[PDB]
Write an enzyme that holds these catalytic residues in place. Structure first.
Site, PDB file in Angstrom:
ATOM      1  N   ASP B 325       0.847  -1.175   0.000  1.00  0.00           N
ATOM      2  CA  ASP B 325       0.000   0.000   0.000  1.00  0.00           C
ATOM      3  C   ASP B 325       0.892   1.237   0.000  1.00  0.00           C
ATOM      4  OD1 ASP B 325      -2.792   1.357   0.709  1.00  0.00           O
ATOM      5  OD2 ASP B 325      -3.092  -0.832   0.783  1.00  0.00           O
ATOM      6  N   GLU B 354       0.698  -0.792  -5.565  1.00  0.00           N
ATOM      7  CA  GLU B 354      -0.480  -0.001  -5.893  1.00  0.00           C
ATOM      8  C   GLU B 354      -0.017   1.431  -6.119  1.00  0.00           C
ATOM      9  OE1 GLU B 354      -4.912  -0.194  -4.212  1.00  0.00           O
ATOM     10  OE2 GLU B 354      -3.678   1.180  -3.028  1.00  0.00           O
ATOM     11  N   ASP B 421     -13.082   0.421  -2.260  1.00  0.00           N
ATOM     12  CA  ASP B 421     -13.068   1.883  -2.311  1.00  0.00           C
ATOM     13  C   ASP B 421     -13.826   2.453  -3.509  1.00  0.00           C
ATOM     14  OD1 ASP B 421     -11.596   2.307   0.057  1.00  0.00           O
ATOM     15  OD2 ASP B 421      -9.684   2.056  -1.001  1.00  0.00           O
TER      16      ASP B 421
END
Ligand SMILES: [Ca+2]
Ligand SMILES: [Ca+2]
Lengths: 585, 585
Positions: B325, B354, B421
């Site tokens: 992340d 990501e 998300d």
């Protein structure tokens, strides 16, 4: 405008930090296609409503076919997203972002430099930023110790012409005895070609990495040389041949003796045993079929560790940096770790590579500090020496090369005129000293690190290897002292003018007809303009000069005081004359 | 042709090896400018008068503005120099090399790829090449143990509409209890969002990197999941949040308490002391002003070592990879050493990043294996769900993205439709299942790694966070079994047709009027043509099919056999129908 010709990438030489909070960005477009380039940026987390900051990207230069725009982004958050606003000659505007081009900013998208870590700011040694390096070919510089001369050493005379297997007795003691000379010249560092123990005449086939070749000296003498050069403000740089070893290398001789039973067999690239043959060889070597030079498997943790110990050993002797050989054939991980080791031992140790093609992959900040500027040599040869290209082409080539890497690399590029593997620059100029001098004046005032090849400062001449490796002329009456003083003067100026060492470069004037080129070096408010009349004719020229840069200049070479009238500077140069104009700031 | 629009570099995504002796090279040019592109190459040390090898570069694809050509160079020496020979529409022949462009080969020079090191050949896990990842949001997948349910937990039903701080009790136990369901679906890997101990609901502010959060389970339970998943052919991927820790992180707690005297003060980015105050932050954190998420100084060797230990701990537990992340805000050296550590402990461990922008800097082979393909999602939403773009624009977007990185990365990019998300993809299609299925058909047959968001396979809908995080529907009556069987079918075909997992991608047809798009996946002699009729209308299309690739095809979804006549294939597609034509090879 032609959008397919516009380019930028958020990395490499087009996007890189110069500090923890400042990101330099560059964009290229077809020459003359873009008149204005602005950068709209903000913190990557900024709200979709906050006002973006503006950064006008000035035109840093242009080459054969491209225009280069450069901007500086102030990013206190160390994170930034940005988009370009490009305006054409007839007023058409378009935003350029990661998504592409659009009249609407949103549809253009935005480039992103995720985060600026301090450990990733390209950092190079301060001293190297204003150094003048001298290349020593040990076998032929000075013979201070006749007792270590190879069998059959020939006489040391000016009228001598070296053969592929000649010997003159050049050694480290000689370099020591001649340090006063080097100090007088003003060199800040000596660069030596391989001097480690080797059975051959060239020494590129290393037998013992932890020892100086007996014909050159020994450890005690090397330590003395290091200390004596240092007290004279002269640093020592050695040539590291880590890509391959010699066939006398302890590891290789072991493999030749125990074959597949050797504990070092995997330190090399062997196809099949036994390892040898006539005109034939079953193992990878330097180039093609070079038995005395078996390639080392640097990917092997054991090989890497050994070479790293070699590095530690010599740096413990106090050396100031390395000149890598065939560096591009050793893996990148080795180089990343090599830099970590070197820098942890000495933050001021310099790492210079030698690569005959785009070295961007090695000039990002995690590997080398710089490389040999062979591009600079090619441009200087064809411009000042052979006359194959004119002032405009010269300008293009120079600019194109300049935009190849980040500014930290380009600023420390070793700008050579020649080497032990090429004809001497004087000979390239067909013995014309006027052409030779104009080139040295350029070398000494251009962006990068000047590299003097032993003997050039006293006017030595010679055809390519091995004729360029003649014994250094020490008899003053046989040296060109006029030239010597010229070099010394240029060297002194370079150290006194901050813009010549730490300043940027911008083309000032380029005329293909008169074959006259001029550029400006700038640091803060200081400006130094260099005008080169590369014509065997007395020519007059008109240079543009807005009052902002000053209206009065001084020729550091002659003391003449020139004055600009109405934003123009009228200059009259003599054949192959160069002027170094300082704006007094 | 527009020469300033032609691009290539001897590194990155344009020049890279696929093996120790093969170099893949790519060249970009303005669309239509080059009709033929050939590569003339040889060993870097080859003699001038030596004959050059030839390599034809076929048009790999085109996007909005460019054509992309690709060739494969055979380099037994592992060293190569090369120049392109570009032919224009009018037959003009221009050479392109490092020097530039010229009608003469010599004046254009050559690019060089110094050496191909086996350790530099981008390598990814074999199982990842044909995987189908299932994204599990633990809190909402399955509540297997009510004892760990947090206070306030709501009911587990279909009509349950989650609130920002809702609770349902999903945990690891539930995952284990539902493994038979996941096995039946055919997924080969499970991707979990953060599950380490944290005081918040989201758990992105890690309190203890070495412990499973109590509401989700404990170490014994996690181990059970690892083993039971494994014997089911299901691997486990954990979310690594190494860019920042939570304010409960032991090191940070020590800094909050001992402040300037804290032993871990340099483990973070602290402006001034005391290390905190009410509603205000004096230390760097995730995004902007997030006191609960202090940024970790991964450049600090101590921080790196700790995080590496964290990785060791979970890898010893049997996990199969990591999903990083905010990876682009951690230094590169950290990721390179991370990969080295991860691959040494388990060469088959996967590393996925990501990054919401060009990730080429992390996709060279020395850092991540792949990243989330956000471009893939954006393209499928606009083409299949909103209809903002037509087949041609869709084709261009795909091709552009595809050329961003080297093939090894592109082949393993996570192709997601949605996430915790974002709104559910079915919701993006406005509930139209026909459109949803065509997108899934595409997802399951395109280049990359398909990623299923929990519940999408059974028809779950919902707006973005938190409506996309609704309790998984487990009542077979409430589940869209028709869709479930559709997913299962696509997954089986993907595993049986090698070209769907290890084949290249080539656009086959794109018509902006019919809004029909087709591509061909190829491996060895196998060809699988995927035809998408993205329009609510029965349409017929005539596709070009040279007899070289076959004259008969089988639609693997219906059993229908189609035949081509004189290099053409006539297909009749029903509204939103997709065909998967196997050439029997
Ligand atoms: Ca001697
Ligand atoms: Ca529970």
């Amino acid at each position: 405008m032609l959008l397919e010709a516009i380019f930028h990438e958020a990395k490499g030489s087009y996007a890189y930090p110069i500090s923890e909070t400042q990101l330099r960005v560059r964009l290229r477009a077809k020459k003359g296609d873009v008149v204005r380039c602005e950068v709209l940026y903000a913190d990557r987390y900024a709200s979709p409503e906050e006002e973006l900051a503006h950064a006008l990207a000035g035109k840093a230069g242009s080459d054969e076919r491209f225009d280069y725009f450069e901007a500086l982004l102030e990013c206190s958050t160390k994170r930034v997203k940005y988009v370009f606003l490009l305006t054409g000659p007839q007023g058409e505007a378009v935003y350029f972002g990661e998504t592409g081009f659009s009249a609407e900013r949103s549809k253009a998208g935005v480039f992103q430099y995720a985060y600026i870590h301090r450990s990733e700011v390209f950092t190079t040694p301060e001293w190297a930023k204003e150094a003048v390096i001298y290349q020593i070919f040990p076998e032929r510089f000075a013979n201070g110790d006749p007792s270590n001369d190879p069998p059959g050493t020939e006489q040391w005379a000016k009228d001598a012409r070296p053969r592929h297997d000649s010997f003159y007795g050049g050694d480290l003691k000689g370099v020591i005895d001649r340090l006063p000379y080097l100090e007088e010249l003003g060199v800040t560092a000596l660069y030596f070609t391989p001097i480690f123990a080797s059975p051959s005449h060239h020494k590129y086939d290393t037998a013992d990495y932890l020892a100086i070749d007996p014909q050159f000296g020994d450890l005690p003498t090397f330590r003395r040389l290091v200390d004596e050069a240092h007290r004279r403000g002269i640093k020592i740089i050695l040539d590291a041949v880590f890509n391959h070893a010699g066939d006398q290398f302890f590891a290789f001789r072991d493999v030749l003796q125990k074959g597949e039973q050797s504990r070092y067999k995997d330190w090399f690239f062997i196809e099949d045993f036994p390892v040898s043959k006539t005109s034939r060889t079953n193992y990878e070597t330097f180039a093609v079929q070079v038995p005395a030079m078996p390639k080392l498997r640097t990917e092997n943790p054991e090989v890497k560790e050994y070479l790293f110990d070699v590095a530690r050993f010599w740096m413990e002797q106090g050396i100031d940096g390395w000149r890598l050989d065939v560096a591009n054939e050793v893996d990148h991980a080795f180089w990343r770790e090599f830099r970590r080791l070197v820098k942890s031992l000495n933050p001021d140790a310099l790492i210079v590579g030698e690569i005959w093609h785009d070295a961007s992959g090695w000039l990002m900040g995690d590997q080398f500090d710089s490389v040999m500027n062979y591009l600079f040599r090619e441009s200087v040869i064809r411009f000042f020496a052979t006359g194959e290209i004119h002032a405009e082409r010269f300008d293009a080539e120079l600019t194109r090369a300049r935009m190849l890497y980040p500014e930290q690399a380009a600023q420390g590029l070793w700008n050579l005129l020649d080497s032990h593997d090429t004809e001497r620059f004087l000979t390239s100029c067909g013995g014309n000293e006027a052409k030779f001098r104009l080139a040295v004046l350029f070398q000494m005032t251009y962006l990068g690190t000047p590299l003097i090849y032993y003997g050039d400062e006293i006017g030595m001449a010679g055809a390519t290897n091995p004729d360029c490796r003649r014994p250094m002329i020490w008899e003053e009456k046989e040296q060109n002292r006029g030239l010597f003083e010229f070099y010394k003067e240029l060297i002194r100026l370079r150290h006194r003018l901050a813009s010549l060492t730490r300043g940027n470069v911008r083309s000032w004037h380029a005329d293909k007809q008169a074959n006259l080129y001029a550029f400006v070096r700038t640091v803060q408010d200081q400006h130094v303009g260099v005008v080169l009349n590369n014509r065997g004719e007395k020519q007059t020229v008109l240079l543009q000069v807005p009052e902002s840069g000053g209206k009065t200049w001084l020729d550091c070479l002659t003391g003449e005081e020139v004055h600009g009238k109405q934003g123009q500077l009228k200059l009259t140069l003599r054949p192959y004359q160069g002027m170094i104009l300082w704006n007094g700031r």
